[PDB]
A paper describes a structure:
One such enzymatic activity is encoded by the [name]-[name]-2 [name] [name] (MTase) domain, which, together with another MTase nsp16, caps the viral mRNAs for stability, efficient translation, and evasion of the host immune response. Specifically, the [name] N7-MTase domain methylates the N7 atom of guanosine at the 5’end of mRNA to generate the N7MeGpppA2’OH-RNA structure, which is then methylated at the 2’O atom of the initiating nucleotide by nsp16 to make the N7MeGpppN2’OMe-RNA structure.
Compared to the DOT1LSGC0946 structure, the t-butylphenyl group and the urea-isopropyl linkage in our structure occupy different positions relative to the deazaadenosine.
Residue numbers in the entry: 5 to 81, 300 to 402, 433 to 455, 466 to 526
The structure:
């Protein structure tokens, strides 16, 4: 199963649907169908009726429809290493952006047992906390079990990071990833964005309001950032498809990221 097909079908692109047809043809010895028989993405494919499938593919449509129902009832397991890398990719993107946007002087990293910074180049005082620190890193980790009822009046400077540290309730100045609502009342959902300050380079166009790059100030994303945006979106989809959700302090504002780009 190609990697994209391990995502829930709602995340499948038009090219993913076409690769699904080819996989299904070989796995089930079906009559070859033109790759454009289902010229749509997975969101659209889920809207078709079984009749629609039969009309589009008289020879294999019913089978394809049932295959889709089985995939929907029994999601495929994702790869732990790819999901690890995806989550780390998102973590670095989101925390890097938050620090650039709001210039927090301190980050309180709660639930980090290894004392590894996700954004090592940030100009910020990084502080680590964990209820069970790794013995080889405890010398620089505060042994602490966070509970809102006990600590809501602490860590009010800077920003708190809870990256899969599933506490009872998060304080208002937090960045959160949680694997699957009262825990989140002080926060808002974090919508998808991509931010990059790497140099633009020119050697399918990308149209998207969520590509926060110097070259998208004028709507003409460079090839380099187009590529990096699509790779980042793939990581983000793999993480959301696997059941993680991202939450953030309510003042988080992507226009603060657009303002990092200046006109000289
Ligand atoms: C960050 C990490 C170390 N640990 C991850 C736990 C959750 N794991 C998880 O959600 N993993 C996962 C989810 C889904 C998948 C797939 C296969 C479905 C994709 C795979 C893995 C948590 C770290 O945080 C520390 N911890 C936990 C609590 Br709760 C806590 C606390 N209250 N105060 C301080 N430290 C705390 C703990 O002591 C501990 O250090
Ligand atoms: Zn660019």
């Amino acid at each position: 199963l190609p990697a994209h097909l391990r995502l829930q079908p709602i995340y499948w692109s038009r090219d993913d649907v076409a690769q699904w047809l080819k996989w299904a043809e070989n796995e089930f010895s079906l009559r070859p169908i033109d790759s454009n028989t289902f010229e749509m993405n997975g969101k659209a494919l889920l809207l078709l009726t079984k009749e629609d499938f039969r009309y589009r593919s008289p020879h294999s449509g019913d089978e394809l429809y049932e295959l889709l129902q089985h995939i929907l009832a029994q999601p495929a397991a994702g790869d732990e290493l790819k999901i690890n890398a995806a989550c780390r990719k998102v973590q670095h993107m989101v925390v890097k952006a938050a620090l650039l946007a709001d210039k927090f002087p301190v980050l309180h990293d709660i639930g980090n047992p290894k004392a590894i910074k996700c954004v090592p180049q940030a100009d910020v005082e990084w502080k680590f906390y964990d209820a069970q620190p790794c013995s080889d890193k405890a010398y620089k980790i505060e042994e602490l079990f966070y509970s809102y009822a006990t600590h809501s009046d602490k860590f009010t400077d800077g920003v708190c990071l809870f990256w899969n540290c599933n506490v009872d309730r998060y304080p208002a100045n937090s960045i959160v990833c949680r694997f699957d609502k009262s825990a989140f009342v002080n926060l808002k959902q974090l919508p998808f964005f991509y931010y990059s300050d790497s140099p633009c380079e020119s050697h399918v166009p990308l149209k998207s309001a969520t590509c926060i790059t110097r070259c998208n100030l004028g709507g003409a994303v460079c090839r380099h950032h187009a590529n990096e945006y699509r790779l980042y979106l793939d990581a983000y989809n793999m993480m959301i498809s696997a059941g993680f959700s991202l939450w953030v302090y309510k003042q988080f504002d992507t226009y603060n990221l657009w303002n990092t780009f200046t006109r000289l």
